[PDB]
Amino acid sequence: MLDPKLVRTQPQEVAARLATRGFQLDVARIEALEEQRKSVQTRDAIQGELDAMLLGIPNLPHESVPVGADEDANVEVRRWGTPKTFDFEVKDHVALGERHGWLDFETAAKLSGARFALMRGPIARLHRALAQFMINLHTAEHGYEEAYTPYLVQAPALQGTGQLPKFEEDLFKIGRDGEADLYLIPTAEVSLTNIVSGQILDAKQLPLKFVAHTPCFRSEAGRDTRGMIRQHQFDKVEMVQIVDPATSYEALEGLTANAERVLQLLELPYRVLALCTGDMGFGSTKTYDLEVWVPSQDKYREISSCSNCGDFQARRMQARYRNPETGKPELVHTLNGSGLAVGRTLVAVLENYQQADGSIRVPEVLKPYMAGIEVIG
Amino acid sequence: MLDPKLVRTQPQEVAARLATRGFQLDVARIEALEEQRKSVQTRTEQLQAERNARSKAIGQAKQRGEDIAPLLADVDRMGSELEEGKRQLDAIQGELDAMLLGIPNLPHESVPVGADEDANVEVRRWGTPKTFDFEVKDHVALGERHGWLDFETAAKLSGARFALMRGPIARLHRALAQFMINLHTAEHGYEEAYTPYLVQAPALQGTGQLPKFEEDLFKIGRDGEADLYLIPTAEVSLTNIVSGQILDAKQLPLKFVAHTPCFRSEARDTRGMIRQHQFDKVEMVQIVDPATSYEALEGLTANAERVLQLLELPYRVLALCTGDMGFGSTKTYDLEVWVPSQDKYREISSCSNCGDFQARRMQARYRNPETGKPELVHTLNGSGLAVGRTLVAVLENYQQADGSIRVPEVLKPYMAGIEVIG
Numbered sequence: 001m002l003d004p005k006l007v008r009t010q011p012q013e014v015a016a017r018l019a020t021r022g023f024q025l026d027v028a029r030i031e032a033l034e035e036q037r038k039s040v041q042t043r044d045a046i047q048g049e050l051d052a053m054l055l056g057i058p059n060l061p062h063e064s065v066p067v068g069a070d071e072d073a074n075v076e077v078r079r080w081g082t083p084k085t086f087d088f089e090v091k092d093h094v095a096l097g098e099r100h101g102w103l104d105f106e107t108a109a110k111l112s113g114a115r116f117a118l119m120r121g122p123i124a125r126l127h128r129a130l131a132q133f134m135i136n137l138h139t140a141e142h143g144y145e146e147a148y149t150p151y152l153v154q155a156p157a158l159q160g161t162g163q164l165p166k167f168e169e170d171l172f173k174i175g176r177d178g179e180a181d182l183y184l185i186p187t188a189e190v191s192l193t194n195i196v197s198g199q200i201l202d203a204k205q206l207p208l209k210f211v212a213h214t215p216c217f218r219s220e221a222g223r224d225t226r227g228m229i230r231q232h233q234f235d236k237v238e239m240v241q242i243v244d245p246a247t248s249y250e251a252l253e254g255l256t257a258n259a260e261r262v263l264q265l266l267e268l269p270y271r272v273l274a275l276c277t278g279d280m281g282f283g284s285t286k287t288y289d290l291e292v293w294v295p296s297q298d299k300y301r302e303i304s305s306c307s308n309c310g311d312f313q314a315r316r317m318q319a320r321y322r323n324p325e326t327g328k329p330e331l332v333h334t335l336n337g338s339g340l341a342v343g344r345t346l347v348a349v350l351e352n353y354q355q356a357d358g359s360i361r362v363p364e365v366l367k368p369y370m371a372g373i374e375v376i377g
Numbered sequence: 378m379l380d381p382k383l384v385r386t387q388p389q390e391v392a393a394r395l396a397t398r399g400f401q402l403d404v405a406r407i408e409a410l411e412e413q414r415k416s417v418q419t420r421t422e423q424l425q426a427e428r429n430a431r432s433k434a435i436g437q438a439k440q441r442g443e444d445i446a447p448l449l450a451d452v453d454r455m456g457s458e459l460e461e462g463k464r465q466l467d468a469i470q471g472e473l474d475a476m477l478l479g480i481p482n483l484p485h486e487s488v489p490v491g492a493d494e495d496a497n498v499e500v501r502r503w504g505t506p507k508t509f510d511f512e513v514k515d516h517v518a519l520g521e522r523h524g525w526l527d528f529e530t531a532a533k534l535s536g537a538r539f540a541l542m543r544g545p546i547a548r549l550h551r552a553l554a555q556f557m558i559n560l561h562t563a564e565h566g567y568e569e570a571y572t573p574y575l576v577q578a579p580a581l582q583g584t585g586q587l588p589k590f591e592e593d594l595f596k597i598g599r600d601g602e603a604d605l606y607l608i609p610t611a612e613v614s615l616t617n618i619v620s621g622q623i624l625d626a627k628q629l630p631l632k633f634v635a636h637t638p639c640f641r642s643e644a645r646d647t648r649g650m651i652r653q654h655q656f657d658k659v660e661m662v663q664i665v666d667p668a669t670s671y672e673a674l675e676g677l678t679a680n681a682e683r684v685l686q687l688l689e690l691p692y693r694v695l696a697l698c699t700g701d702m703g704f705g706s707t708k709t710y711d712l713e714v715w716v717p718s719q720d721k722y723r724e725i726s727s728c729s730n731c732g733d734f735q736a737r738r739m740q741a742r743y744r745n746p747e748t749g750k751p752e753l754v755h756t757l758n759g760s761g762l763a764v765g766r767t768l769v770a771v772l773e774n775y776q777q778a779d780g781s782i783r784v785p786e787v788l789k790p791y792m793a794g795i796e797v798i799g
């Protein structure tokens with residue numbers, strides 16, 4: 001949610017800033033509900049309608065965010081590594097993995113339908129090695145505290161991070177009789193960020209850094225029909241930060257660097273994109289996407305999204321900290337970033353590390369997790 | 378599913394064996410459906426003989442220049458009744474098929490006959506429960522000390538029977554699951570698998586959770602799509618890898634291991650991590666040659682015990698009696714770990730031989746080398762182990778006087794130098 005004072009004192013400036021995202025602020029309804037409540041007080045229903053409107057408003061993009069309409073207006077800020085030149089015809093992860101039944105889409109389809117995967121033996125072990133390396137890296141070197149969370153949440157947690165009320169269709173819901181319904185988490189951002197909801201933290205507690213390795217579940221309601229790039233279920237190592245508002249934009253640079261370090265250590269060439277106003281997610285003020293080189297596609301493909309949410313989720317969660325200067329409980333800033341989506345890292349590893357015979361070289365950092373295996377197949 | 382020829386021809390012997398589980402087979406309905414089938418079949422055979430003869434008589438009556446109208450009318454009526462006889466036979470078979478899907482497995486002859494859990498026998502025990510020189514604390518008191526085990530934030534997120542773990546306790550829980558998968562893949566001959574955690578109904582019918590135990594599952598309703606269910610155990614996804622297949626006898630045994638979260642509606646243990654809606658479990662599954670399955674069960678049980686022995690957790694092995702078994706099991710061994718604050722052993726694993734019961738439901742077969750004909754395989758599953766319950770056991774058995782937790786030896790390589798928690 002946006003600062004309600006801003007939606008009252010500066011309605012035109014807020015609408016002009018939101019217009020860069022392609023969002024049309026209903027200035028007419030707000031000016032009317034403000035004129036209605038002012039008449040009723042002079043002489044709960046009028047607040048209830050405004051609250052639902054306020055919960056449907058995307059975050060204000062930060063001033064440094066490039067103004068654009070779509071993904072074509074996203075800006076490459078930097079790159080790392082040289083995409084490999086292969087001395088043979090490049091295979092995709094599907095062809096590589098299906099050769100010994102170690103990556104199996106057909107058995108997964110027989111079990112669960114489309115957008116599911118079965119991994120076996122060394123490919124299953126490589127996927128597990130990737131998630132373990134990621135969580136070990138962030139806990140040892142990047143200052144994140146590990147967390148195991150529920151993968152099923154109720155509606156208030158999703159509303160806290162912004163998936164509810166507007167994006168229900170993107171979630172898998174478990175309808176329960178005489179109980180509140182549950183939703184499968186689309187990301188550990190939901191469970192991790194909500195740890196601090198309804199609380200007044202000590203300034204000394206900041207920054208709060210969390211990391212969780214969880215499965216992620218998305219209906220994918222709204223491309224990538226072949227392979228495991230866009231699955232209903234995927235593992236992801238999520239980084240979440242609860243920070244002092246004055247530090248959040250510096251925290252985004254550090255968070256993005258944390259995600260980048262995973263790719264650098266795996267020696268996976270990538271690029272960093274600053275998302276334009278018209279391509280960013282609902283709850284973000286500023287986003288950097290990491291896109292890994294995919295040899296069979298001859299392009300970079302998204303593997304991480306690192307965002308600063310400012311006070312947007314904190315306002316929905318009523319997550320505060322006691323400001324050391326004023327003594328006043330003030331909203332915190334929240335940030336989240338993939339470090340990384342594990343299934344997409346497995347795609348990047350299989351493809352970038354393939355050899356002429358169709359075998360796969362094991363990345364150096366993953367060899368301690370591969371029980372002696374150095375070449376797959 | 379039991380052998381359908383066995384249920385239909387010997388309802389009395391099948392009923393007597395199921396009576397040991399306390400289950401009352403509807404022999405009267407099975408026999409009444411069988412009498413109806415026989416009656417319809419005899420009528421259809423008599424009608425086929427009649428119709429085929431009248432159809433041939435038409436040609437003969439034509440040769441004599443006679444009126445074929447009475448014969449044509451007989452043939453038409455007889456054929457219409459045969460089509461009905463066929464729909465009747467299909468509906469009878471459909472009813473018997475639905476009934477046979479609700480029958481528990483036949484217990485093996487070696488299973489002690491008993492009505493309840495009091496007839497369960499202790500097979501053996503390993504290790505000695507520690508005598509503490511101080512008042513023992515339960516896992517809730519131990520984990521809550523620094524907020525590293527937090528049910529309060531979990532309830533705020535998801536309601537009751539959920540947990541949040543943080544820092545060294547979250548690390549310890551991950552270390553346990555990693556140790557378990559590494560052990561089974563390296564020493565016990567299991568092939569690792571990552572599986573879907575959401576499955577459609579046929580997979581749950583294949584292992585036996587469907588059609589009878591739908592209420593125990595979390596379901597995701599989907600508009601103009603097959604519904605999805607959250608897996609209650611990796612037994613569901615792993616065992617169904619071989620559904621609809623005719624395996625080479627050389628591929629047997631197929632041994633699978635998976636570390637997955639497990640989701641149960643749980644439709645007891647209100648405080649704590651013992652009975653959660655979500656829990657991690659390292660599942661062991663075997664697809665075996667029917668002649669080797671009971672020996673396979675002994676080995677499967679030993680693979681699960683090895684986790685407890687290596688973690689130095691005192692435990693007990695119980696052979697479940699006829700009246701205390703799971704729906705799809707012919708024989709089960711339960712492992713019970715020592716829980717200091719409860720002053721008793723608590724269930725941590727169930728290792729079962731399913732015989733050919735799940736294999737029949739999923740048509741998981743193998744080509745027999747002697748006959749060359751496809752035959753049903755046997756399936757087995759066992760917890761190696763339920764990760765949340767092992768964590769409960771580690772926190773309580775390894776607790777120190779100050780409330781700190783000593784890290785088990787085998788877990789220190791996964792704990793990044795941490796030897797004592799808190």
Ligand SMILES: Nc1ccn([C@@H]2O[C@H](COS(=O)(=O)NC(=O)[C@@H](N)CO)[C@@H](O)[C@H]2O)c(=O)n1
Nearest residue numbers: 187189230231234302303304305336337338341
């Ligand atoms: N079905 C899918 C959908 C997405 N992903 C991968 O998850 C990343 C994070 O998702 S996010 O939606 O872009 N942001 C988040 O969830 C934030 N919590 C930060 O992680 C994407 O950048 C993509 O690489 C996938 O692998 N399969």
Ligand SMILES: Nc1ccn([C@@H]2O[C@H](COS(=O)(=O)NC(=O)[C@@H](N)CO)[C@@H](O)[C@H]2O)c(=O)n1
Nearest residue numbers: 610612652653656724725726727758759760763
């Ligand atoms: N809510 C719950 C329910 C159960 N459990 C633990 O799962 C084990 C296996 O479950 S089973 O139902 O007994 N058999 C199976 O699922 C088989 N696939 C073999 O693994 C139990 O022995 C108990 O220790 C828990 O931790 N939390």
Ligand code: NA
Nearest residue numbers: 289302304305
């Ligand atoms: Na994204």
Ligand code: NA
Nearest residue numbers: 711724726727
């Ligand atoms: Na059990």
